[PDB]
Amino acid sequence: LHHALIPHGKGGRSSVSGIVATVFGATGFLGRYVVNHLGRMGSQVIVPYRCEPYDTMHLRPMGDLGQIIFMEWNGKDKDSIRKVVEHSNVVINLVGREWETKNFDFEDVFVKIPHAIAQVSKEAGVEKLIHISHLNADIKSPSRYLRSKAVGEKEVRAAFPEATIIKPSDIFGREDRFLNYFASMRWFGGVPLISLGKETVKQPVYIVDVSKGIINAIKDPDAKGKTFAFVGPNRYLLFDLVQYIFAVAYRPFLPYPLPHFAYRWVGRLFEVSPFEPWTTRDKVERVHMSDMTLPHLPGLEDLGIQATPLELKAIEVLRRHRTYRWLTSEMEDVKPAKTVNI
Amino acid sequence: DTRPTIRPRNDVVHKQLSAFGQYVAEILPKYVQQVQVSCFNELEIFIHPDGVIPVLTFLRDHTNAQFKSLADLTAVDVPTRQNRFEIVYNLLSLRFNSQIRVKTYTDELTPIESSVTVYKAANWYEREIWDMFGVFFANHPDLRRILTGYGFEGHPFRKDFPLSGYVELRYDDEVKRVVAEPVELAQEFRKFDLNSPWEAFPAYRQPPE
Amino acid sequence: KLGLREIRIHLCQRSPGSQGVRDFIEKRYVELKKANPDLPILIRECSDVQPKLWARYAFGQEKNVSLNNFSADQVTRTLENVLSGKA
Amino acid sequence: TQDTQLIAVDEKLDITTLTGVPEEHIKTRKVRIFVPARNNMQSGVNNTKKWKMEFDTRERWENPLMGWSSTADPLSNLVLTFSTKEDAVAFAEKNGWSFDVEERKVPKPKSKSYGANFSWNKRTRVSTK
Amino acid sequence: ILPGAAYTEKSATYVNTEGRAQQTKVAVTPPGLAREDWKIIRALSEIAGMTLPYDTLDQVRSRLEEVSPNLVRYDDVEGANYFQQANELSKLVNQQLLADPLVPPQLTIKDFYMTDSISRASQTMAKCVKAVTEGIQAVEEPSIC
Amino acid sequence: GTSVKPIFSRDMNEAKRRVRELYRAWYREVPNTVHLFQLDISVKQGRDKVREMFMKNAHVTDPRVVDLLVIKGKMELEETINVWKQRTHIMRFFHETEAPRPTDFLSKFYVGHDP
Amino acid sequence: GVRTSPTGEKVTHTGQAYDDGDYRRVRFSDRQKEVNENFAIDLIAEQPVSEVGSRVISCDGGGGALGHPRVYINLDKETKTGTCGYCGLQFRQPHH
């Protein structure tokens, strides 16, 4: 190890840990928390950004002065990535759009730029890489999300043989676009879950669990080339989350089955909005898709993190969607959803 | 003054205060252990911990004293003394424009019954001496914290308490709430040993011990 | 196993209790060396330590007896067994 | 002579719990006691007269940006002053710190002279003046 | 190679050639990944199975006392005696001599300079080695601040 | 020396007597503080936590000292129930933001050169 | 004057030089490594050497009150030219 990268301190904010992160697209949900965990023991992140610096303003108070640098970077440009990864012990990739964009497509955001950053990182001389994919990333899956994730996954793995791969099942948290997305369904009448959502199972993962799992993977010397997958402690049927999170939000639960083709029609209609679409056809069939149960891939328990229950850390997020009539209601009133055991 | 550099003295007040020192001394030989008038016409009444009401009530209502103004009361944490704390009241007399200082010794555990009855100005003047130092005041209306943070631990003015304390805050975005951690400074305090090895003014030199 | 390779005693200089070992190593130490030459006898002598035993066996085992206020004639007896049980 | 509902406690007085030094700063701090030795190129001795309360030094690392001495030892820059010693130790156990002392290195009486520099048999004849 | 600490960054016990024990104290801390001297031994013992019992600093001093009573008593000259007892075990050996003259390793001042690794590492103290070798010529460093 | 002042309690018997009802108050409050402070922790972990700080100093014998923590501990239950403290002031006891500190000798040795 | 490091990285007068990797260098990216072009060492070395014929010369440094504490540097060393500590500019005696 280099003389300037020897870790020191008690793992505090101004302590130095010798890890030099270069998290990509951290101006998002999970990128926020990993940087927050990255600044816990004082690891100088680079966090290249493309949006306005004001939207990146909130990341400053997660590290000592000069520990969180900000570098302008463009995905399409080649030298843009290289200019932020020359002096990085590790490189973390989190770039991903959950909807179609005119200037960036699912393919462009999931095979083009992760391969490009991986090949320059190996060329630059990085020591690690953490490319995240989806646990549901299947090459022949109906969703454009999962197939794009899969083709990029083999691309980065081929480009970087030692690139540790993370595939969390589904991410639930403060602004997950998953729990709040279900809560947002109240404004459009009843819940438009196809066939009452009785045929779909998911296993959500807490942010603190996955975000920690990143830097335990970073500090673990045996994670090079592994393909860790992060899943929650319990799975639940799709109809098993909907009423539970409605109940924990105390909102009027109105399930309403409807045909899938019309569900696709609604998804396309919401896509026509020039601004950020509320829903797209990709997430339309991604919701009803059921996660696998593959145990061969190592999990977060291998690194030494226990997967927190969905019902345990839920009051923090779903409390916002409650009204004044239930803002002070505890989680004793609600009951844990009917877990489907493996 | 033939020597404008040096500050002139005033013996007229000096022995008048000394006379008043003996005055209070003879009245309470059970309380007044030590009386001392310094060079700068300052009177000191060293009292026993039990005497916080009587001598102050004496100094407040007496015809020859009339000291009703509670200037301040403060502690002087001296580690090398068996009684670390030294509560030091200050009294002001409107009628005689003089100042009176009284001192009482204390350990961490020995209590002082509150002087709220004597001086009701002292109500808020224990809520911090309990905070900063930790000397508890008996039979007192409220002993709440008003200087230290809510739920802060320790008595910072104690000379064994570090300058930087133990807890440092930071807004943690994981929990959306400011939280405390063990302190770790950007730079440590470059303490200076500026006490000259050659003896200062020999007037107050300590006797051969 | 309990194979013996180090013998130590700890005595105080002027203590009456240590007079036993003090008489021991004064009169009866040179032939104790002659008894088994190849086994060093660390007789460490320090202040305000009662006459005390330290016999280091194999594997790292080290066992002791508290020969406090003993006499010269049985201290060799107290160490005959550790010579007898040297293996 | 001070009877106020008089009670008796024979336990050695410790106040650690109420003072609230964190539990990792109560046992892992080997507190050593000495009278500061005079700086050897300072003939004055108005420092070799009290006792201090210095701690054990902890890790001191350089700040990544500006080369500071960032230190996570809250208690490093703190020394007390004690006239005599048993109060200094009496201070030591009442908050229950790991405790040791060092005896005051009193200057031995130097038998000084000036005629020795000009002797007739003794070698104390100085070679320069 | 196990990176060990130096005497300035370790709470060491050193005994002088007259038997008195001295306790060193940590002035600076060991640089980089290096640890103290007995910490690595205890760490390897724990990882190799034969875990040593004394797990703290004070524990090793007590064990040091238990294996040597004079060692843990700092700044104290414990009396050593029984010189004639040592004499008796010297009479029976009778190894005659070797006739080469007593030449101390530090024959001149130059040999005094070069003793230990910290001495050989030190370049400023090596300037004096040049100084005694030739004179004053090169070791003259201007300082007119 | 041994003879000393009873700040509030003569004997260790009445020291626990001051601990008892104060624990009762420090037992009763948990459902209401967890409700109006709008936290996420459950009542039970609040209950067993109350035990936790009742434990660490359950080893002193001096009657003055123990009942000094009695008034010391008396001094936050009202600081909480009259909403004087903050959510950041009672999550502080629920030490959560720091990574687990090292317990085994190997873990300290790996982290750094500091006991 | 000022030199340049292998990474360009104009080396300051003190001699600071970030080595090849030295992750700390990333702070100079998209920014400039502030270095003072004027280097004191070679900006005084070329200054003319004073020639005063006396053993002791004051060295107030110009504007006595505004300068630096006046010294009384000696001028008897013929090997090298004696300079004030604070001023640094060099006094030499012409053939003593």
Ligand SMILES: NC(=O)C1=CN([C@@H]2O[C@H](COP(=O)(O)OP(=O)(O)OC[C@H]3O[C@@H](n4cnc5c(N)ncnc54)[C@H](OP(=O)(O)O)[C@@H]3O)[C@@H](O)[C@H]2O)C=CC1
């Ligand atoms: N439940 C879930 O949502 C799960 C998601 N993932 C994957 O995690 C990744 C990130 O998730 P999350 O952080 O929540 O997503 P967000 O939408 O909250 O943030 C995505 C980030 O990607 C950046 N980004 C996207 N496209 C580009 C581009 N073309 N050029 C530059 N930056 C770009 C965004 O920049 P900007 O902020 O400026 O838009 C932002 O920083 C995605 O790939 C996602 O599929 C993995 C597991 C579960």
Ligand SMILES: [Zn+2]
């Ligand atoms: Zn000058």
